[PDB]
Amino acid sequence: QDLSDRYESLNNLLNRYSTLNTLIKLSADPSAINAVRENLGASAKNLIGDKANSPAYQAVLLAINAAVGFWNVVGYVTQCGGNANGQKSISSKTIFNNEPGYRSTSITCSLNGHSPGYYGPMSIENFKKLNEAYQILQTALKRGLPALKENNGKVNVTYTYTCSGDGNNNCSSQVTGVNNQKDGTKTKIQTIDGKSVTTTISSKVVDSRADGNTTGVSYTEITNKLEGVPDSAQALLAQASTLINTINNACPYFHAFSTTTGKICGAFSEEISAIQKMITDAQELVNQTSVINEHEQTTPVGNNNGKPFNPFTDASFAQGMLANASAQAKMLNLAEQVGQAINPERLSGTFQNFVKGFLATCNNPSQGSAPGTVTTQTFASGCAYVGQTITNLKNSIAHFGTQEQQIQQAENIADTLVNFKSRYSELGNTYNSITTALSNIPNAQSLQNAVSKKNNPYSPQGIDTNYYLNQNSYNQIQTINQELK
Ligand SMILES: CC(=O)N[C@H]1[C@H](O[C@@H]2[C@@H](O)[C@H](O)O[C@H](CO)[C@@H]2O)O[C@H](CO)[C@@H](O[C@@H]2O[C@@H](C)[C@@H](O)[C@@H](O)[C@@H]2O)[C@@H]1O[C@@H]1O[C@H](CO)[C@H](O)[C@H](O)[C@H]1O[C@@H]1O[C@@H](C)[C@@H](O)[C@@H](O)[C@@H]1O
Fold this sequence. Notes:
Layout lengths: L1 H26 L2 H20 L5 H20 L18 E9 L2 E6 L14 H20 L10 E11 L8 H4 L6 E10 L2 E12 L12 E12 L2 H18 L2 E3 L5 E3 H4 L1 H26 L23 H25 L6 H11 L26 H14 L1 H18 L1 H20 L11 E5 L9 E5 L1 H12 L3
The structure holds a molecule of 5 linked components (GAL-NAG-GAL-FUC-FUC).
A molecule of 5 linked components (GAL-NAG-GAL-FUC-FUC) binds next to β3 and β6.
Protein name: Outer membrane protein-adhesin
Keywords: Signal
PDB class: sugar binding protein
């Protein structure tokens, strides 16, 4: 009926009025503002300092694990080969160790007679980039990711690959930088995510007839040791980004899922799309960290010398407090978005099957294997704890409800303080709208005292009007409103 709508609208406005009235009062009381500030600094600590219990940590971890896991699933079908500078080769076998190959802990790039590129074999230049990102990630994950507040942790990373076959120049001193291919070294300063890392490149030739060589051919083995690689959230998401984008940029031929021959960037476009979005949301989330750290909540507000707190003039801290609280809300929203992108309960079709049946599983034999473990059975499965990270992310979000409420409270109070005059007018304006709604309901003379107000020229806080709610009238209004229907 018409009248139900009038009672519903009025009940809602009375709820709003009462909440705004409370926001005004909270914003004029330093002991309440201080408790909300303290709760806000404590949630920040949680988000940025904790692991298991931080949705921010779990969302970063999930973005990283999705990328590593994607490669563990599709690597073994992805074709690679050729000689340096992305050139076609005749007989170049280049093997990368600690990679999820078909029944192997290496991937063999041995596609001869076809020019590397889009819908062809991945060039060795791209595989070298992909593989370095993958080794950094797997090494960092085995050791464990630091909390979002530790941005200067470091890891050492070592990996090896070999070249064999007549004319293979992917391990030549020209390409590696070493003094002598048979027995050589080169050290340089390499930039990774804006940091300087020391890199040591070693080269040796193992002759076909050397002791311990069961392969029946001569090969060159190249060792890359990176010391001091950054393992921060930021740096590892950059590596996850490099890994996924290098796969997309190369878009290589594969040869095996809903498709069993094609190009990786096509048959797996939906998965790539989700994982890029996860990395980007996680990076934006990590960017919110710096806003949080810049606006700390440790100092009590209010004047300490007897001056009553005046919200019009004594609230210069509120802008920082709003930036902080808004940035923490933003971190939660993004973390939730990382989770939604890959959660199999929200997916359908071949994307759901890829996630449940491949990405989120591990074929490694056993408490499962540690993170960063590659075995002869990894291929076609994620082996990156992706199923359990989805779960730990959903759970950390659900158990962060306490802090989510406190973040909301701080956003509301800080917004009020930043905009005090304007929020205090809005209270008055909500009053005025209620007074009209009241005047336009039937026979209801005894409800017209539901709100009232009084002048107070003496407020030491500039709060020259007091706003009231009559509890009886409110209750009656609430009953009447429920009783339709
Ligand atoms: C090709 C090839 O691998 N040639 C290397 C050779 O053995 C081969 C045996 O694998 C196989 O059983 O027979 C084949 C003949 O059909 C091969 O020849 O082994 C020798 C000695 O161990 C390698 O030579 C040495 O290492 C090089 C870098 C150089 O210092 C030599 O002076 C040293 O003796 C030989 O490698 C090739 O050597 C030539 C010069 O003879 C060129 O340097 C060439 O670049 C080089 O091949 C390259 O290095 C290989 C070790 C291997 O990684 C290959 O893929 C790469 O292209």
